[PDB]
Every structure is written in structure tokens, then in C-alpha cells.
């Protein structure tokens, strides 16, 4: 209370290093008991927080004056007392972290950050080691992980988990400098040895996903983090050891106990948040091809081959080793599910490189574009917009496949004999298209003799931009290509945001006079 | 007379008047013209053999 604040100010203004330690121990016992009592029961509106604020300022001044070091003549009271007081206050802050069913913005964060900064200053001031608070980072991450959620445990809408203390920690301490993430990732591996707590510490991984997956690391040059407290245990410049322990702890957590949403997200951004930061990112390839051959009839587990393709292509670009019989698998993988997935753009931004090959056949590209035409029969306009320039690019730079879209044996040309045009008539009477959709091999099906009616019928469409991007086959091929990665990130809300305004002068009357027939 | 490598053939060379060597996919197949028949095939690769 206010009397505790006055006693703390008096015991900090006077040194008196017996009764000051006794009054600090009494106020610390009162602070721990009031924390366990008014922890969201009679919710502590800055009461224990103000007590810990006064105790943190007093312990900061006392640590700047005299802390546990080499003694004058065996100071078995003051140095041990300040050490026990600091340890008990940090353990009480960790206890308030581990027992917190609510969060009024200061349930554990202020006390934990104050004790962490005070431990860093105490290590760098006593100078007996270099960042020796990383041993207490074990119980720190144990508390900030065991700060369990009531109902926000891996919500099925966004992210992979929603833990306020973990996201505020990775905002305010874990990514404001550079070495404590390295020491955390090593001490996570030195944590995960006995099964007793790691059976809980491998339960729900999405909190660590939101904790580490931020693209702010030291091995990533996009945002380099600055210098920590001035006692270096060669920590930031040991990126190689950082990469190896990163790889080891990542494989140990990825071994078991997946949730489906966290599995989907970690497969969605495995290619960039995980792959380039390893010491030897080859230990993930069989996991990635198991995700690629993961074909269940479950409707959620069908996005799994789509998210695996980026990591698999990163692997094959890094060093050539294959998944065999590639293109009939890539043939069978696309369907209206794949066209109505959220990741049309993220799929086509790898489909263009996978289909820009030199060795593939006219048979393969013919089967691809005709089954894709039967696919784009049934699509939204945001799928027509992304599917038409890719197929135009492929039919342009594989110009033998124009035999589908054009046939010169069936032209209504004037200058030939009535015998020849009657032979044209009986040929267009007895002609049969040999296509079949259910054949899954591209070169074995008959897609060449079967023409492409589907985009010709897709010209007739209720959107003039789809009309002007669908008459490109009736018009000639004077234009080279269209900019897929500057063309493809368009959803329905972005499309309406695009044509909410334009060169705007549009008005027309309503003279239908068709009201009193069926007005519903 | 035609000879059908089941994979799309990538290279056709001749090593003799009798037998030729054609490759497509992850195996190369030796054909003989006098027997008009495939008689060897080795597939000790990963991806398609290209020359």
C-alpha cells in the first residue's frame, strides 16, 4: 500500500543494510501474497505493480551501488541478502506469469521486463560472466509459455495462436536486440532433454510460431538488430552456432504433436521463414515430400500439396533431387478446389516457373491447357483474371499448340470446289473429339485433336474487363506477356476497391417499364 | 518400322549398324534393327537423361 511505498522510499533513501533488507523482505512477502490474492480476483489496479515499480527502482539503485561481488571481509549478510531478494522478486514475477488467467496489460509484462533488464544490468555490472541471466531465461520462457490461455489457444480464424504475453514479449524484448534470441534458441535445446516438462513444451507449437516467425533474425539481412548489454559472450557473431542450434531445436519441435492449422501455416511459410536460416536445410525434405504426397479425402488436407510446392522448389533449386514422375502429379493436383483455394496467386507464381520449361512436350502443354480450360469453365472473375494471361503466355511461347485454337482444314474459304466444301461438311459431320478428363497422364491422353471451346465460351461474360482479357484469342498475338506478379494479387475486395473509381462519367436511364408483372 | 520408347525420347544415337541407343526419361534403351527389338535398358539415374 501507500505505507509500503513510504517504507520502500525510506529504506532506499537510507542505506542501512540490515533493516533495509528486512523491510524489503517483508514488503516482498506482502507483494507475493497480495499478487496471489488480487491476481484478477479483486483486480490489482497498479497496486502490486506500483509496489514492484518502487522495488525495481530501489533494487536498481542498490545494484548500481553494491551488489554480490568479491566481499570486503566475507559479507555473508548484504550480498547474499540482495541476491536472495532479487531471486525472490524475479521468482514472484515468474509466479505471476505462470498463474495469470487474465491480462489487464500488466499481469506479468512490467515486472518480468523490469526483472529481466535488472538481471542484465546486474550481470553486466557484477562482471563475473557475460549475460548470465540466460540461465534464468529457462524459467522465464517456462513461465511465459505456461501462461496458458483460456480460450485463445490456437483460434481457427487467424495466425496460429493468440497469446498476448508472447506477442508482446517478441515485440518488446526478444526483437529489440540480437543475442538473446540466440541464447533462447540454444537454451530451448538445453531445456528439451527430460520428457517431464517437454511433453507439455511440445503440445501447441503455434505460440512459438508467433514467437520466432517474424523475419527479424541476425542471419537475415532484412532487419538486423542492434547491440545488446555490453558484456559479449561472442553471441551475435556466432551465427553458425546459432544456425545449428536453430536447426536442432526446430527439428525437435517439428518431430511431433501437430495441430492442423499450425501445420498448414508452417507449411505455408516454411520456404522463407525456416529454410534459409538453417545450417544445413536438408533435414526437411522428406517431411516436405510427405506433405506433397499427402492425399487424403479430408477437405482440409488438400491445401497441403499446394503449400509444399514452394519449399520443394526451393529444395530443387538449391540442389537437384527430384520427386519422380512430376508432371502427371502436377496434372492431377489441380481441380476446382485448387482454383477456388485462397492461394491462386501463390500457386501460379510457382506454376509459371514450373511450366516455363524447355523440355516439356506439346502433348503435355495441350493436356494442361485443355483441362485447365474445362477447369476455368467454373470460376470466379478473380480466377478468370489470373488464369487468362498464364494460358496466353503458354500458348504464345509454345506456338505449335495453336492447332487446338485454330484448325485450317475447317475454314469456310470461298476458292475451292463444291466437292471440297462438301467433304468439309461431311468431315465436320462425322468428326469426334477424343478428349477424356479422367485420364491423369498428360502425354497419354488425346488433347491435341480436341480443340478448345471453353475460353471461346468464356468470352461471353458479364464483366467488360473479362471481355477485354478474353478476346485476346480472337485478336492476334502482337502483345508479348503480362506481368503475373504485378498482376495476380487481386481478390474480390481489391477488385471492388479497384473499380470503385475510374475515369468516371457513367449514367444511363431506365425505360424498361417492366414493373407490374412479377415484383416479388 | 518404328520403335517405341515409352518415355518421350530425348536422344537417338547410333553405335553400330545393328544396334542404336535411344534415351528418354530416367533410362536409356538399346534397340537392335535386325531383331527390330529393344534388348537392353539401364535406369541408374534420377531425372531424365539428356544426352
Amino acid at each position: 500500500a501507500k505505507r509500503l511505498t513510504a517504507a520502500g522510499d525510506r529504506k532506499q533513501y537510507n542505506s542501512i543494510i540490515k533493516l533495509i533488507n528486512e523491510l524489503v523482505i517483508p514488503e516482498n512477502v506482502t507483494q507475493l501474497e497480495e499478487d496471489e490474492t488480487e491476481k484478477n480476483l479483486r483486480f490489482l489496479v497498479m497496486s502490486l505493480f506500483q509496489i514492484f515499480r518502487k522495488l525495481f527502482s530501489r533494487g536498481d539503485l542498490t545494484l548500481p551501488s553494491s551488489k554480490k561481488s568479491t566481499l570486503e571481509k566475507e559479507q555473508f549478510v548484504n550480498w547474499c541478502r540482495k541476491v536472495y531478494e532479487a531471486f525472490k522478486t524475479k521468482l514472484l514475477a515468474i509466479i505471476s506469469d505462470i498463474p495469470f488467467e487474465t491480462s489487464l496489460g500488466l499481469d506479468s509484462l512490467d515486472v518480468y521486463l523490469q526483472l529481466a533488464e535488472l538481471e542484465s544490468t546486474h550481470f553486466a555490472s557484477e562482471k563475473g560472466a557475460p549475460f548470465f541471466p540466460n540461465k534464468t531465461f529457462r524459467k522465464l520462457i517456462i513461465a511465459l509459455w505456461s501462461s496458458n490461455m483460456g480460450e485463445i489457444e490456437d483460434v481457427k480464424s487467424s495466425g496460429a495462436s493468440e497469446n498476448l504475453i508472447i506477442v508482446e514479449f517478441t515485440e518488446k524484448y526478444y526483437t529489440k536486440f540480437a543475442d538473446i534470441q540466440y541464447y533462447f534458441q540454444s537454451e530451448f535445446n538445453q531445456l528439451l532433454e527430460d520428457p517431464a516438462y517437454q511433453d507439455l513444451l511440445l503440445k501447441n507449437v503455434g505460440k512459438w510460431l508467433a514467437l520466432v516467425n517474424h523475419d527479424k533474425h541476425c542471419s537475415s539481412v532484412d532487419a538486423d538488430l542492434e547491440i545488446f548489454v555490453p558484456n559479449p559472450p561472442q553471441a551475435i557473431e556466432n551465427e553458425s552456432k546459432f544456425k545449428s542450434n536453430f536447426e536442432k531445436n526446430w527439428l525437435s519441435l517439428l518431430n511431433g504433436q501437430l495441430s492442423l492449422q499450425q501445420y498448414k501455416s508452417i507449411l505455408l511459410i516454411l520456404h522463407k521463414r525456416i529454410i534459409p536460416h538453417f545450417h544445413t536445410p536438408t533435414k526437411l525434405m522428406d517431411f516436405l515430400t510427405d506433405s506433397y504426397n499427402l492425399q487424403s479425402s479430408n477437405k482440409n488436407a488438400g491445401v497441403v500439396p499446394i503449400l509444399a510446392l514452394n519449399g520443394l522448389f526451393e529444395l530443387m533449386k538449391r540442389f537437384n533431387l527430384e520427386y519422380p514422375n512430376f508432371y502427371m502429379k502436377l496434372y492431377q493436383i489441380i481441380n476446382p478446389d485448387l482454383m477456388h483455394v485462397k492461394y491462386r496467386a501463390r500457386f501460379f507464381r510457382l506454376m509459371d516457373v514450373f511450366l516455363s520449361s524447355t523440355h516439356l512436350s506439346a502433348h503435355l502443354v495441350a493436356s494442361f491447357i485443355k483441362k485447365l480450360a474445362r477447369l476455368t469453365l467454373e470460376s470466379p472473375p478473380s480466377a478468370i483474371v489470373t488464369v487468362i494471361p498464364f494460358i496466353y503466355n503458354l500458348i504464345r511461347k509454345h506456338p505449335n499448340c495453336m492447332i487446338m485454337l485454330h484448325n485450317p482444314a475447317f475454314i469456310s474459304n470461298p476458292f475451292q470446289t463444291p466437292d471440297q466444301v462438301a467433304n468439309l461438311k461431311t468431315l465436320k459431320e462425322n468428326y469426334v473429339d477424343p478428349f477424356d478428363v479422367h485420364e491423369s497422364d498428360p502425354e497419354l491422353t488425346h488433347a491435341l485433336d480436341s480443340s478448345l471451346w471453353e475460353l471461346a465460351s468464356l468470352m461471353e461474360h458479364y464483366h467488360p474487363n473479362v471481355a477485354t482479357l478474353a478476346k485476346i484469342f480472337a485478336q492476334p498475338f502482337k502483345k508479348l506477356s503480362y506481368n503475373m506478379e504485378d498482376f495476380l494479387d487481386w481478390n474480390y475486395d481489391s477488385l471492388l476497391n479497384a473499380e470503385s473509381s475510374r475515369k468516371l462519367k457513367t449514367l444511363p436511364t431506365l425505360e424498361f417499364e417492366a414493373f407490374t408483372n412479377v415484383f416479388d | 518400322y518404328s520403335l517405341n520408347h515409352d518415355q518421350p525420347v530425348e536422344n537417338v544415337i547410333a553405335v553400330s549398324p545393328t544396334q542404336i541407343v535411344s534415351c528418354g526419361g530416367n533410362n536409356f534403351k538399346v534397340w537392335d534393327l535386325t531383331s527390330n527389338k529393344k534388348l537392353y535398358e539401364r535406369g541408374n539415374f534420377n531425372k531424365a537423361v539428356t544426352c
Binding site: N255, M285, F287, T289 | -
Partner: peptide, 17 residues
């Protein structure tokens, strides 16, 4: 869902090919 282990053996398979 696969429930065996995620670690690397088809690299050994097509490195033994």
C-alpha cells in the same frame, strides 16, 4: 497426421539410385 517422424530417407533413396 502422418505420425511416423519427419526426417530424411528419400534423399537416401535417390542418392542410392
Amino acid at each position: 497426421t502422418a505420425t511416423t517422424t519427419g526426417t530424411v530417407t528419400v534423399i537416401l533413396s535417390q542418392a542410392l539410385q
